Design a protein around this motif. Structure first.
Motif: not given
Ligand SMILES: *[C@@H]1O[C@H](CO)[C@@H](O[C@@H]2O[C@H](CO)[C@@H](O[C@H]3O[C@H](CO)[C@@H](O)[C@H](O)[C@@H]3O)[C@H](O)[C@H]2NC(C)=O)[C@H](O)[C@H]1NC(C)=O
Ligand SMILES: *[C@@H]1O[C@H](CO)[C@@H](OC2O[C@H](CO)[C@@H](O)[C@H](O)[C@H]2NC(C)=O)[C@H](O)[C@H]1NC(C)=O
Ligand SMILES: *[C@@H]1O[C@H](CO)[C@@H](OC2O[C@H](CO)[C@@H](O)[C@H](O)[C@H]2NC(C)=O)[C@H](O)[C@H]1NC(C)=O
Ligand SMILES: *[C@@H]1O[C@H](CO)[C@@H](O[C@@H]2O[C@H](CO)[C@@H](O)[C@H](O)[C@H]2NC(C)=O)[C@H](O)[C@H]1NC(C)=O
Ligand SMILES: *[C@@H]1O[C@H](CO)[C@@H](O[C@@H]2O[C@H](CO)[C@@H](O)[C@H](O)[C@H]2NC(C)=O)[C@H](O)[C@H]1NC(C)=O
Ligand SMILES: *[C@@H]1O[C@H](CO)[C@@H](O[C@@H]2O[C@H](CO)[C@@H](O)[C@H](O)[C@H]2NC(C)=O)[C@H](O)[C@H]1NC(C)=O
Ligand SMILES: *[C@@H]1O[C@H](CO)[C@@H](O[C@@H]2O[C@H](CO)[C@@H](O)[C@H](O)[C@H]2NC(C)=O)[C@H](O)[C@H]1NC(C)=O
Ligand SMILES: *[C@@H]1O[C@H](CO)[C@@H](O[C@H]2O[C@H](CO)[C@@H](O)[C@H](O)[C@H]2NC(C)=O)[C@H](O)[C@H]1NC(C)=O
Ligand code: NAG
Ligand code: NAG
Ligand code: NAG
Ligand code: NAG
Ligand code: NAG
Ligand code: NAG
Ligand code: NAG
Ligand code: NAG
Ligand code: MAN
Lengths: 125, 447, 105, 52, 48
Positions: B229-232, B238-242, B389-396
């Motif tokens: 993320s940029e600032d948690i 938005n927070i990126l997850v791999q 192949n689902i790999t990522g996630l985007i979470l507020t």
């Protein structure tokens, strides 16, 4: 000029739904977020939520979870705010704020505000 | 004694700058020349000459990079340019008299309407099948008289099917005079120095796939899952997850459609889904259950590092307010799906029976948010079956709460460009400054 | 958790005054860069100083804030007859209780 | 132009718009233009003196 | 109805988004953007 107009509302009865508006002008409306804040008479501020008019993605606090709905009509650059199943402690004044001009890039804090509308309820007439 | 100046040419010195980059593809032959131009590109080298470096330190920033904006501009410009000589569906918005499909107590409806012909005086009457998300009533008081959705505000153009939308690898290759620096750290938290830095001619293949709430066909991590993320500590990014292991997902539309072509004018054609032959059923998508629970356990164990060693983690479905960033939207086989994802983030964490998900289908889409444009989609013949192949996630993060240890997480569609940030976070363009001055002793003979 | 601040502090004309408030430092950490708002009686609030050590445009810099090692403070230098308004501190999402700055007639 | 016009927008097709003057509210009067007199005569005198 | 003039109110047919509907509309036009077509002698005007 960068500003936000609202529409004054009349006193509503308990158990009714209010309609709050917020119309902006000048700067582009589909570029920045827009927050909603409330102020109780004689108390401090409290944040309600934030809507992104670009894609309609909203996020509001847990104090109003499941009771408020926020929409947007970008065809005329106006916002909306609905709230039903009211109570007596929700007597306050509401404001819509943006972050149009600031050196920093973070979403907080917001500086420009609008006129504001004071909404209050009465059990009887 | 005193010193003198010396000028050096070819000295390695770089400076953070920006410029334009061109295409780069590999030698491949094929129903070709899709929207991503291939004939008008540069054939890449057989083997990239990756060069390693030592004792070199520099900074990075994934939230201020300039390659993603240029990639988005190139993608939108190419998509707009590859639709100019195609057919325009102007006279399609004639009023409709559309009936129910006789299934007793429904997703699609048969509509009949008037249509022109090559002869300017003749008028024919044709019928077709339309989905329920591309039709809006006009009377409401209360009879059935329907019309399309887009030609109340904007115009509409068809996508003649001689081209395809299948994503293909695209290498971004810097021009002569610049260079690219790749970081190879296994703990790159997003911002800061990187010990292992390499210089490559230019990057590898990139699949510009569009997706919301869930990345697809990305790049797998190594040895761990990544939470960036940029600032948690604020609820505005938005927070990126791999993930570190791709999860298999199978979407399918079991219907058996038929393409029906009708004339709309001299030299034009108009395709429609003429009839559905077989069994009327809803298009669905399956995902494994045990692997999903294991991956969620891994990601919550990794996320616990940023929110105290003992907290309650909860998930919730999307907030709502649209048809593109509330559901899971993607495209495959030439069709756009919208699969609800509520049956995934419906758990609560503290201290072989696969999952199914329904899917709706739209035709008149408004992708690449704009005004005055709307892209029709031709129907695909046969059946469709897409494995991914689902790999990522985007979470507020969450809304505001008084005080607790039970913060929630809700997925929300990003800004339709973060899908590439999961692939362009380890690249940076830089220029060369081969000039410099150095002090040492010299006395050039005047003679 | 939340931010707290004294309800009211006294002030005399001409004298420089100060207001300082800070909650638990585990949430602050000294880098959240708490802002400061001015709430006028029956009017629309406006920003006096944003994140930290910086003043926005359109407002005079005769009164300004700073951030110490464990507490953010706001010094009003040269108090005048136009400082009859409440002062609020605000984090990203959290807010304070409220402070009133009174003058002597 | 002292008139008080009104813009009236009507639809002409899918995605297009057509604007026109509305029904004017106010006083129907002719658009005019004013110029100072003494300065004009002085400038004309100067220019004829130069042209002589 | 100004009794005895610079502009005139005209009314005409116009299409709509639906290809079969036809809605009449009125507007105001200046006297320098309109030329008669009949001249013998009724009022039927057109653009220039
Ligand atoms: C993620 O990457 C997948 C690649 O494994 C991709 O799947 C492939 O999608 C195509 C599109 O229709 C399917 O059909 C293709 O391959 C068949 C082979 O007979 C051709 O006849 C078709 O014309 C077409 O080229 C593939 O079956 C499918 N799988 C494989 C292994 O190629 C997904 O579509 C990608 N995800 C997204 C969202 O695009
Ligand atoms: C969709 O429906 C098609 C029409 O019945 C069907 O097509 C044919 O396949 C059957 C089965 O082998 C043949 O008997 C028939 O001759 C074929 N006709 C043509 C014109 O190709 C498709 O097979 C159906 N789709 C699927 C996936 O089965
Ligand atoms: C042109 O005519 C307008 C319509 O009456 C008029 O508009 C408004 O101004 C009056 C005067 O203050 C207001 O009472 C009224 O609420 C206004 N309405 C709107 C919709 O703006 C304009 O002022 C007139 N033009 C001029 C130059 O006076
Ligand atoms: C939608 O309506 C059309 C016309 O009413 C249907 O087309 C015909 O279908 C009927 C079946 O009830 C046949 O008996 C006719 O021979 C067909 N052709 C004509 C010219 O009438 C169409 O099948 C309907 N759609 C669905 C899914 O049933
Ligand atoms: C998605 O589709 C693939 C391809 O059929 C499935 O993979 C296989 O699993 C079945 C039974 O589980 C086996 O009979 C096949 O041999 C497998 N093939 C391969 C290539 O692995 C996969 O199981 C499907 N996903 C789900 C969740 O069912
Ligand atoms: C054209 O308009 C200007 C602006 O109103 C006029 O200028 C002024 O003159 C009036 C009266 O003569 C004064 O009350 C204003 O203070 C003047 N303003 C400025 C900025 O000079 C000007 O007179 C007009 N022209 C004519 C020919 O009348
Ligand atoms: C030009 O003609 C039109 C139609 O005759 C006028 O529009 C109407 O105006 C009359 C005024 O006499 C009103 O009573 C009607 O209610 C208006 N609407 C309709 C639908 O008839 C228009 O006002 C005329 N233009 C001018 C400048 O008078
Ligand atoms: C997200 O999940 C909740 C979980 O129930 C869904 O909830 C509710 O809303 C439905 C229709 O709006 C009602 O029929 C349910 O009774 C109601 N349930 C609860 C517990 O409140 C919600 O619809 C889901 N949101 C989306 C966009 O799918
Ligand atoms: C890199 O630095 C180390 C430590 O200073 C040194 O031993 C090594 O030789 C350096 N590498 C090169 C290529 O000079
Ligand atoms: C058509 O379907 C709608 C959808 O519910 C239903 O309300 C209506 O009664 C149906 N009419 C007929 C004639 O089947
Ligand atoms: C045009 O003229 C011909 C003359 O025979 C007539 O038959 C026709 O109806 C006219 N146009 C149309 C399409 O009606
Ligand atoms: C074409 O339009 C006419 C009247 O506008 C209508 O009666 C007819 O049914 C329409 N054609 C079809 C195929 O419905
Ligand atoms: C990454 O690590 C640096 C090093 O301290 C830190 O300043 C930065 O906030 C971290 N960012 C994230 C997203 O963890
Ligand atoms: C979410 O989980 C609860 C747990 O009992 C279940 O009752 C509910 O049906 C689930 N929601 C969905 C949409 O499956
Ligand atoms: C998906 O993952 C499997 C297993 O690692 C791999 O074989 C397959 O190539 C992946 N799909 C794509 C499109 O790379
Ligand atoms: C439209 O045309 C018809 C005949 O062509 C005419 O009778 C009618 O008056 C026209 N519409 C208007 C608004 O004048
Ligand atoms: O054959 C129809 C269809 O089949 C599959 C792919 O090869 C497509 O490119 C092709 O258009």
């Amino acid at each position: 000029q960068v500003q936000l107009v609202q529409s004054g509302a009349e006193v509503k009865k308990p158990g009714a739904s209010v309609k709050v508006s917020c119309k902006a002008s000048g700067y582009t409306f589909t570029g920045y977020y827009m927050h909603w804040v409330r102020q109780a008479p004689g108390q401090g501020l409290e944040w309600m939520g934030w809507i992104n008019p670009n894609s309609g993605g909203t996020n509001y606090a847990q104090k109003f979870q499941g009771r408020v709905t926020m929409t947007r009509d970008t065809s005329i650059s106006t916002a909306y705010m609905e709230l039903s199943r009211l109570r007596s402690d929700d007597t306050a004044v509401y404001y819509c704020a943006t972050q149009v001009k600031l050196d920093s890039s973070a979403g907080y804090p917001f500086d420009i505000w609008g006129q504001g509308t004071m909404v209050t309820v009465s059990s009887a007439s | 004694e005193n010193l003198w100046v010396t000028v050096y040419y070819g000295v390695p010195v770089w400076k953070d700058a920006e410029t334009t980059l061109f295409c780069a593809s590999d030698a491949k032959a094929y129903k070709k020349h899709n929207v991503w131009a291939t004939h008008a590109c540069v054939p890449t080298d057989p083997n990239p000459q990756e060069i390693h470096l030592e004792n070199v330190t520099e900074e990075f920033n994934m939230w201020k990079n300039n390659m993603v904006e240029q990639m988005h501009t190139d993608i939108i410009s190419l998509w707009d340019q590859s639709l100019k000589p195609c057919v325009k569906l102007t006279p399609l918005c004639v009023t409709l008299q559309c009936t129910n499909v006789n299934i007793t107590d429904g997703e699609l409806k048969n509509c009949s309407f008037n249509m022109t012909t090559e002869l300017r005086d003749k008028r024919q009457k044709v019928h077709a099948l339309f989905y329920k998300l591309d039709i809006v009533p006009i009377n409401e008081n209360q009879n059935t008289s329907y019309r399309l959705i887009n030609c109340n505000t904007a115009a509409i153009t068809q996508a003649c099917p001689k081209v395809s939308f299948e994503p293909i690898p695209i290498h971004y290759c810097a021009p002569a005079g610049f260079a690219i620096l790749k970081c190879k750290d296994k703990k790159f938290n997003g911002t800061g120095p990187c010990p292992s830095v390499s210089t490559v001619q230019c990057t590898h293949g990139i699949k510009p796939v569009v997706s919301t709430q869930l990345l697809l066909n990305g790049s797998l991590a190594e040895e761990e899952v990544m939470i960036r993320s940029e600032d948690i500590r604020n609820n505005a990014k938005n927070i990126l997850v791999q993930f570190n292991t791709p999860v298999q997902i199978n979407c399918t539309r079991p219907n058996n459609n038929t393409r029906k072509s009708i004339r709309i004018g001299p030299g034009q054609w108009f395709y429609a889904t003429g009839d559905i032959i077989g069994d009327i059923r809803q298009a669905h998508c399956n995902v494994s259950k045990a692997t999903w629970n294991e991956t969620l356990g891994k990601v919550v164990k990794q996320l616990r590092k940023h929110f105290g060693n003992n907290t309650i983690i909860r998930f919730a479905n999307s907030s709502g307010g649209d048809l593109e960033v509330t559901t899971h939207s993607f495209n495959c086989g030439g069709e756009f799906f919208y699969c609800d994802t509520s049956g995934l983030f419906n758990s609560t964490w503290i201290s072989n029976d696969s999952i199914t998900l329904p899917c709706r289908i739209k035709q008149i889409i408004n992708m690449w948010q704009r005004i005055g444009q709307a892209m029709y989609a031709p129907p695909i013949q046969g059946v469709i079956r897409c494995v991914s192949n689902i790999t990522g996630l985007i979470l507020t993060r969450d809304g505001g709460s008084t005080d607790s240890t039970t913060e929630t997480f809700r997925p929300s569609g990003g800004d339709m460009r973060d899908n590439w940030r999961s692939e362009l976070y380890k690249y940076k363009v830089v220029k060369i400054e081969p000039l410099g001055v150095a002090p040492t002793r010299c006395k050039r003979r005047v003679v | 958790s939340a931010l707290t601040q004294p309800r009211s502090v006294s002030g005399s004309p001409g004298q420089s005054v100060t207001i300082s408030c800070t909650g638990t430092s585990s949430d602050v950490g000294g880098y959240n860069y708490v802002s400061w708002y001015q709430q006028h009686p029956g009017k629309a609030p406006k920003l006096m100083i944003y994140d930290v050590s910086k003043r926005p445009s359109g407002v005079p810099d005769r009164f300004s804030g700073s951030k110490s090692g464990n507490t953010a403070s706001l010094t009003i230098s040269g108090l005048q007859a136009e400082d009859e308004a409440d002062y609020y501190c605000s984090a990203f999402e959290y807010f304070g209780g409220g402070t009133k700055l009174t003058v002597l007639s």
